[PDB]
mmCIF file of all heavy atoms in Angstrom:
data_model
loop_
_atom_site.group_PDB
_atom_site.id
_atom_site.type_symbol
_atom_site.label_atom_id
_atom_site.label_comp_id
_atom_site.label_asym_id
_atom_site.label_seq_id
_atom_site.Cartn_x
_atom_site.Cartn_y
_atom_site.Cartn_z
ATOM 1 N N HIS A 237 82.000 84.965 101.424
ATOM 2 C CA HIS A 237 82.493 84.150 100.320
ATOM 3 C C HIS A 237 82.039 84.748 99.006
ATOM 4 O O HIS A 237 80.992 84.635 98.541
ATOM 5 C CB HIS A 237 81.964 82.702 100.442
ATOM 6 C CG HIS A 237 82.529 81.794 99.442
ATOM 7 N ND1 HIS A 237 83.505 80.877 99.751
ATOM 8 C CD2 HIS A 237 82.409 81.615 98.091
ATOM 9 C CE1 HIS A 237 83.850 80.205 98.776
ATOM 10 N NE2 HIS A 237 83.132 80.564 97.684
ATOM 11 N N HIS A 238 83.016 85.456 98.298
ATOM 12 C CA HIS A 238 82.794 86.152 97.048
ATOM 13 C C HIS A 238 84.140 86.543 96.406
ATOM 14 O O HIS A 238 84.267 86.336 95.179
ATOM 15 C CB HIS A 238 81.894 87.262 97.227
ATOM 16 C CG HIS A 238 81.402 87.982 95.993
ATOM 17 N ND1 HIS A 238 81.913 89.147 95.421
ATOM 18 C CD2 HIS A 238 80.579 87.563 94.962
ATOM 19 C CE1 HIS A 238 81.357 89.419 94.351
ATOM 20 N NE2 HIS A 238 80.547 88.469 94.030
ATOM 21 N N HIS A 239 84.982 87.155 97.212
ATOM 22 C CA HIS A 239 86.278 87.531 96.684
ATOM 23 C C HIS A 239 87.378 86.421 96.653
ATOM 24 O O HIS A 239 88.237 86.445 97.568
ATOM 25 C CB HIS A 239 86.748 88.784 97.448
ATOM 26 C CG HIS A 239 85.865 90.004 97.431
ATOM 27 N ND1 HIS A 239 86.063 91.041 96.632
ATOM 28 C CD2 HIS A 239 84.717 90.273 98.157
ATOM 29 C CE1 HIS A 239 85.126 91.973 96.935
ATOM 30 N NE2 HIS A 239 84.258 91.466 97.685
ATOM 31 N N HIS A 240 87.148 85.519 95.754
ATOM 32 C CA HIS A 240 88.052 84.359 95.613
ATOM 33 C C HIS A 240 88.334 83.991 94.138
ATOM 34 O O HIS A 240 87.888 82.997 93.686
ATOM 35 C CB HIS A 240 87.557 83.294 96.403
ATOM 36 C CG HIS A 240 88.473 82.047 96.574
ATOM 37 N ND1 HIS A 240 88.252 80.832 95.896
ATOM 38 C CD2 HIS A 240 89.704 81.912 97.091
ATOM 39 C CE1 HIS A 240 89.213 79.945 96.129
ATOM 40 N NE2 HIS A 240 90.087 80.651 96.852
ATOM 41 N N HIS A 241 89.142 84.871 93.478
ATOM 42 C CA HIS A 241 89.381 84.608 92.003
ATOM 43 C C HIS A 241 90.447 85.585 91.570
ATOM 44 O O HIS A 241 91.159 85.270 90.571
ATOM 45 C CB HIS A 241 88.111 84.750 91.214
ATOM 46 C CG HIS A 241 87.429 86.063 91.369
ATOM 47 N ND1 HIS A 241 87.564 87.107 90.475
ATOM 48 C CD2 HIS A 241 86.670 86.501 92.372
ATOM 49 C CE1 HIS A 241 86.806 88.122 90.899
ATOM 50 N NE2 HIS A 241 86.299 87.738 92.077
ATOM 51 N N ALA A 242 90.504 86.722 92.267
ATOM 52 C CA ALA A 242 91.595 87.755 91.902
ATOM 53 C C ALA A 242 92.654 87.771 92.957
ATOM 54 O O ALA A 242 92.657 87.125 93.975
ATOM 55 C CB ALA A 242 90.978 89.031 91.713
ATOM 56 N N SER A 243 93.699 88.553 92.582
ATOM 57 C CA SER A 243 94.825 88.703 93.522
ATOM 58 C C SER A 243 95.608 90.056 93.379
ATOM 59 O O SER A 243 95.739 90.471 92.206
ATOM 60 C CB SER A 243 95.834 87.543 93.383
ATOM 61 O OG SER A 243 95.285 86.363 93.618
ATOM 62 N N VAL A 244 95.982 90.705 94.382
ATOM 63 C CA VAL A 244 96.625 92.023 94.340
ATOM 64 C C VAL A 244 98.156 91.827 93.867
ATOM 65 O O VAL A 244 99.007 91.672 94.705
ATOM 66 C CB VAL A 244 96.605 92.725 95.694
ATOM 67 C CG1 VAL A 244 97.284 94.107 95.503
ATOM 68 C CG2 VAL A 244 95.170 92.828 96.119
ATOM 69 N N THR A 245 98.355 91.826 92.521
ATOM 70 C CA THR A 245 99.694 91.691 92.006
ATOM 71 C C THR A 245 100.072 92.829 91.090
ATOM 72 O O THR A 245 99.550 92.892 89.939
ATOM 73 C CB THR A 245 99.798 90.421 91.284
ATOM 74 O OG1 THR A 245 99.494 89.226 92.118
ATOM 75 C CG2 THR A 245 101.301 90.208 90.731
ATOM 76 N N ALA A 246 100.962 93.717 91.605
ATOM 77 C CA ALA A 246 101.355 94.875 90.753
ATOM 78 C C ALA A 246 100.206 95.778 90.461
ATOM 79 O O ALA A 246 99.004 95.447 90.435
ATOM 80 C CB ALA A 246 102.105 94.444 89.507
ATOM 81 N N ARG A 247 100.514 97.019 90.213
ATOM 82 C CA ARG A 247 99.524 98.153 89.888
ATOM 83 C C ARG A 247 99.799 98.756 88.590
ATOM 84 O O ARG A 247 100.974 99.173 88.224
ATOM 85 C CB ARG A 247 99.431 99.185 91.067
ATOM 86 C CG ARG A 247 98.349 100.183 90.774
ATOM 87 C CD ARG A 247 96.919 99.702 91.080
ATOM 88 N NE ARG A 247 96.532 98.613 90.105
ATOM 89 C CZ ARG A 247 95.536 97.906 90.215
ATOM 90 N NH1 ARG A 247 94.671 97.983 91.271
ATOM 91 N NH2 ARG A 247 95.275 96.920 89.295
ATOM 92 N N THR A 248 98.857 98.930 87.743
ATOM 93 C CA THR A 248 98.968 99.548 86.396
ATOM 94 C C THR A 248 97.727 100.325 86.027
ATOM 95 O O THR A 248 96.858 99.650 85.456
ATOM 96 C CB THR A 248 99.449 98.515 85.358
ATOM 97 O OG1 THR A 248 100.633 97.892 85.801
ATOM 98 C CG2 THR A 248 99.696 99.239 84.038
ATOM 99 N N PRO A 249 97.638 101.606 86.155
ATOM 100 C CA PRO A 249 96.467 102.412 85.765
ATOM 101 C C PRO A 249 96.298 102.393 84.208
ATOM 102 O O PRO A 249 97.242 102.113 83.504
ATOM 103 C CB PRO A 249 96.709 103.735 86.338
ATOM 104 C CG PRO A 249 98.175 103.835 86.466
ATOM 105 C CD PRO A 249 98.641 102.444 86.809
ATOM 106 N N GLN A 250 95.148 102.968 83.813
ATOM 107 C CA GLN A 250 94.948 103.075 82.376
ATOM 108 C C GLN A 250 93.849 104.096 82.040
ATOM 109 O O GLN A 250 92.695 103.895 82.114
ATOM 110 C CB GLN A 250 94.443 101.706 81.733
ATOM 111 C CG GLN A 250 94.214 101.805 80.201
ATOM 112 C CD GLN A 250 93.863 100.402 79.729
ATOM 113 O OE1 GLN A 250 94.249 99.371 80.236
ATOM 114 N NE2 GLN A 250 93.031 100.405 78.662
ATOM 115 N N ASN A 251 94.323 105.350 81.608
ATOM 116 C CA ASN A 251 93.395 106.467 81.377
ATOM 117 C C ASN A 251 92.477 106.689 82.530
ATOM 118 O O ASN A 251 91.345 106.253 82.509
ATOM 119 C CB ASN A 251 92.613 106.164 80.068
ATOM 120 C CG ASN A 251 93.512 105.916 78.864
ATOM 121 O OD1 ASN A 251 93.818 106.881 78.187
ATOM 122 N ND2 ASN A 251 93.926 104.739 78.630
ATOM 123 N N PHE A 252 93.012 107.516 83.564
ATOM 124 C CA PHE A 252 92.167 107.813 84.681
ATOM 125 C C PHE A 252 91.637 106.575 85.365
ATOM 126 O O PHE A 252 90.505 106.189 85.148
ATOM 127 C CB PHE A 252 91.029 108.721 84.212
ATOM 128 C CG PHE A 252 91.466 110.144 83.763
ATOM 129 C CD1 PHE A 252 91.656 110.285 82.426
ATOM 130 C CD2 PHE A 252 91.767 111.110 84.698
ATOM 131 C CE1 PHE A 252 92.045 111.563 81.994
ATOM 132 C CE2 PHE A 252 92.215 112.360 84.246
ATOM 133 C CZ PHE A 252 92.386 112.534 82.870
ATOM 134 N N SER A 253 92.499 105.941 86.108
ATOM 135 C CA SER A 253 92.080 104.703 86.897
ATOM 136 C C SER A 253 92.359 104.868 88.281
ATOM 137 O O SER A 253 91.442 104.739 89.145
ATOM 138 C CB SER A 253 92.877 103.466 86.261
ATOM 139 O OG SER A 253 92.476 102.280 87.030
ATOM 140 N N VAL A 254 93.592 105.226 88.732
ATOM 141 C CA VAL A 254 93.931 105.300 90.075
ATOM 142 C C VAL A 254 94.192 106.803 90.467
ATOM 143 O O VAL A 254 93.615 107.296 91.415
ATOM 144 C CB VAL A 254 95.307 104.474 90.474
ATOM 145 C CG1 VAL A 254 95.536 104.652 91.923
ATOM 146 C CG2 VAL A 254 95.079 103.137 89.977
ATOM 147 N N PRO A 255 94.959 107.583 89.641
ATOM 148 C CA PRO A 255 95.217 109.009 89.852
ATOM 149 C C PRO A 255 94.084 109.844 89.401
ATOM 150 O O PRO A 255 93.410 109.487 88.394
ATOM 151 C CB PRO A 255 96.482 109.212 89.091
ATOM 152 C CG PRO A 255 96.389 108.335 87.841
ATOM 153 C CD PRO A 255 95.690 107.063 88.416
ATOM 154 N N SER A 256 93.833 110.922 90.020
ATOM 155 C CA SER A 256 92.778 111.922 89.674
ATOM 156 C C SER A 256 93.151 113.287 90.217
ATOM 157 O O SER A 256 92.572 113.749 91.220
ATOM 158 C CB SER A 256 91.471 111.420 90.271
ATOM 159 O OG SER A 256 91.093 110.189 89.750
ATOM 160 N N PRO A 257 93.958 114.061 89.435
ATOM 161 C CA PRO A 257 94.224 115.501 89.805
ATOM 162 C C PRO A 257 93.123 116.369 89.577
ATOM 163 O O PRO A 257 92.796 116.768 88.484
ATOM 164 C CB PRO A 257 95.376 115.775 88.801
ATOM 165 C CG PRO A 257 95.253 114.966 87.636
ATOM 166 C CD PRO A 257 94.598 113.614 88.125
ATOM 167 N N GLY A 258 92.497 116.849 90.693
ATOM 168 C CA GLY A 258 91.411 117.771 90.598
ATOM 169 C C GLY A 258 91.760 119.085 91.156
ATOM 170 O O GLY A 258 91.975 120.064 90.411
ATOM 171 N N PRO A 259 91.824 119.329 92.530
ATOM 172 C CA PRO A 259 92.222 120.510 93.131
ATOM 173 C C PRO A 259 93.719 120.960 92.944
ATOM 174 O O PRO A 259 94.549 120.210 93.166
ATOM 175 C CB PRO A 259 91.848 120.385 94.626
ATOM 176 C CG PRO A 259 92.074 118.832 94.801
ATOM 177 C CD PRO A 259 91.645 118.130 93.543
ATOM 178 N N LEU A 260 93.848 122.229 92.455
ATOM 179 C CA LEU A 260 95.217 122.667 92.133
ATOM 180 C C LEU A 260 95.528 123.845 93.143
ATOM 181 O O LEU A 260 95.355 125.018 92.661
ATOM 182 C CB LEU A 260 95.374 123.047 90.687
ATOM 183 C CG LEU A 260 95.193 121.968 89.645
ATOM 184 C CD1 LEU A 260 95.128 122.555 88.314
ATOM 185 C CD2 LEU A 260 96.385 121.046 89.769
ATOM 186 N N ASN A 261 95.922 123.473 94.292
ATOM 187 C CA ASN A 261 96.295 124.522 95.316
ATOM 188 C C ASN A 261 97.647 124.181 95.985
ATOM 189 O O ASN A 261 97.955 124.811 96.925
ATOM 190 C CB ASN A 261 95.198 124.598 96.305
ATOM 191 C CG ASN A 261 93.830 124.917 95.738
ATOM 192 O OD1 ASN A 261 93.123 124.002 95.367
ATOM 193 N ND2 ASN A 261 93.469 126.213 95.646
ATOM 194 N N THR A 262 98.321 123.292 95.362
ATOM 195 C CA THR A 262 99.725 122.920 95.948
ATOM 196 C C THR A 262 100.692 122.930 94.785
ATOM 197 O O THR A 262 100.951 121.974 94.005
ATOM 198 C CB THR A 262 99.591 121.465 96.445
ATOM 199 O OG1 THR A 262 98.564 121.353 97.429
ATOM 200 C CG2 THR A 262 100.929 121.073 97.129
ATOM 201 N N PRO A 263 101.429 124.047 94.694
ATOM 202 C CA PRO A 263 102.512 124.282 93.706
ATOM 203 C C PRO A 263 103.749 123.484 94.044
ATOM 204 O O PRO A 263 104.002 123.090 95.227
ATOM 205 C CB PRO A 263 102.843 125.776 93.752
ATOM 206 C CG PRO A 263 102.444 126.168 95.203
ATOM 207 C CD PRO A 263 101.335 125.265 95.566
ATOM 208 N N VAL A 264 104.636 123.253 93.128
ATOM 209 C CA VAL A 264 105.862 122.481 93.228
ATOM 210 C C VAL A 264 106.979 123.061 92.324
ATOM 211 O O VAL A 264 108.170 122.971 92.683
ATOM 212 C CB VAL A 264 105.646 120.998 92.895
ATOM 213 C CG1 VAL A 264 105.285 120.773 91.435
ATOM 214 C CG2 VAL A 264 106.961 120.216 93.207
ATOM 215 N N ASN A 265 106.553 123.625 91.196
ATOM 216 C CA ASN A 265 107.540 124.234 90.318
ATOM 217 C C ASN A 265 107.966 125.659 90.675
ATOM 218 O O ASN A 265 107.093 126.391 91.299
ATOM 219 C CB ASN A 265 106.957 124.238 88.926
ATOM 220 C CG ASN A 265 106.529 122.882 88.401
ATOM 221 O OD1 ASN A 265 105.441 122.408 88.534
ATOM 222 N ND2 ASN A 265 107.547 122.275 87.665
ATOM 223 N N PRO A 266 109.174 125.981 90.433
ATOM 224 C CA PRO A 266 109.665 127.364 90.869
ATOM 225 C C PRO A 266 108.965 128.551 90.125
ATOM 226 O O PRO A 266 108.633 128.402 88.906
ATOM 227 C CB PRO A 266 111.103 127.401 90.382
ATOM 228 C CG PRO A 266 111.482 125.943 90.189
ATOM 229 C CD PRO A 266 110.228 125.283 89.836
ATOM 230 N N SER A 267 108.584 129.536 90.877
ATOM 231 C CA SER A 267 107.898 130.652 90.331
ATOM 232 C C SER A 267 106.564 130.251 89.660
ATOM 233 O O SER A 267 106.434 130.123 88.469
ATOM 234 C CB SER A 267 108.720 131.420 89.169
ATOM 235 O OG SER A 267 109.999 131.871 89.736
ATOM 236 N N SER A 268 105.597 130.091 90.612
ATOM 237 C CA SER A 268 104.206 129.710 90.151
ATOM 238 C C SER A 268 103.205 130.780 90.511
ATOM 239 O O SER A 268 102.459 130.695 91.484
ATOM 240 C CB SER A 268 103.828 128.355 90.796
ATOM 241 O OG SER A 268 104.653 127.353 90.459
ATOM 242 N N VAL A 269 103.023 131.820 89.636
ATOM 243 C CA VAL A 269 102.102 132.872 89.930
ATOM 244 C C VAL A 269 101.321 133.160 88.658
ATOM 245 O O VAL A 269 100.958 134.329 88.403
ATOM 246 C CB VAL A 269 102.814 134.144 90.334
ATOM 247 C CG1 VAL A 269 103.387 133.988 91.756
ATOM 248 C CG2 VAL A 269 103.900 134.597 89.394
ATOM 249 N N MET A 270 101.042 132.207 87.821
ATOM 250 C CA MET A 270 100.326 132.276 86.586
ATOM 251 C C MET A 270 98.833 132.279 86.839
ATOM 252 O O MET A 270 98.041 132.124 85.938
ATOM 253 C CB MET A 270 100.752 131.321 85.491
ATOM 254 C CG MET A 270 102.172 131.476 85.034
ATOM 255 S SD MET A 270 103.361 131.033 86.272
ATOM 256 C CE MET A 270 103.026 129.362 86.611
ATOM 257 N N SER A 271 98.428 132.273 88.100
ATOM 258 C CA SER A 271 97.016 132.248 88.529
ATOM 259 C C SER A 271 96.732 132.584 89.956
ATOM 260 O O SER A 271 96.450 131.812 90.853
ATOM 261 C CB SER A 271 96.489 130.681 88.365
ATOM 262 O OG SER A 271 97.291 129.804 89.056
ATOM 263 N N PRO A 272 97.097 133.876 90.282
ATOM 264 C CA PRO A 272 96.967 134.446 91.606
ATOM 265 C C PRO A 272 95.495 134.526 92.089
ATOM 266 O O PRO A 272 95.100 134.179 93.214
ATOM 267 C CB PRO A 272 97.582 135.817 91.540
ATOM 268 C CG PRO A 272 97.442 136.225 90.116
ATOM 269 C CD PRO A 272 97.585 134.997 89.365
ATOM 270 N N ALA A 273 94.638 135.062 91.142
ATOM 271 C CA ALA A 273 93.222 135.210 91.430
ATOM 272 C C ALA A 273 92.446 133.869 91.369
ATOM 273 O O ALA A 273 91.326 133.757 91.798
ATOM 274 C CB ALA A 273 92.615 136.232 90.442
ATOM 275 N N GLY A 274 93.147 132.824 90.962
ATOM 276 C CA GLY A 274 92.601 131.518 90.862
ATOM 277 C C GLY A 274 91.676 131.329 89.610
ATOM 278 O O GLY A 274 90.841 130.601 89.618
ATOM 279 N N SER A 275 91.936 132.181 88.561
ATOM 280 C CA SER A 275 91.203 132.129 87.285
ATOM 281 C C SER A 275 91.912 131.363 86.243
ATOM 282 O O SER A 275 92.373 131.896 85.293
ATOM 283 C CB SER A 275 90.939 133.524 86.872
ATOM 284 O OG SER A 275 90.130 134.271 87.769
ATOM 285 N N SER A 276 91.944 130.037 86.487
ATOM 286 C CA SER A 276 92.541 129.099 85.494
ATOM 287 C C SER A 276 92.037 127.733 85.585
ATOM 288 O O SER A 276 92.557 126.832 85.001
ATOM 289 C CB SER A 276 94.127 129.034 85.708
ATOM 290 O OG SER A 276 94.355 128.589 86.989
#
């Protein structure tokens, strides 16, 4: 008995709340070789 006041209704992040892009090892854009040695 403690979680009885809030409700899961819609999601809306605000300045780093839910998403957190850290590791960049998965490309998606065409021609992505601006960091082969991983120095970026």
Side-chain angles (χ1 to χ4, degrees):
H237 189 102
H238 187 253
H239 300 260
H240 186 246
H241 55 106
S243 301
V244 184
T245 303
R247 183 75 292 169
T248 304
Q250 182 179 330
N251 299 270
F252 295 95
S253 180
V254 186
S256 298
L260 294 169
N261 302 89
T262 305
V264 63
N265 301 90
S267 300
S268 299
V269 293
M270 293 70 63
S271 59
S275 299
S276 60

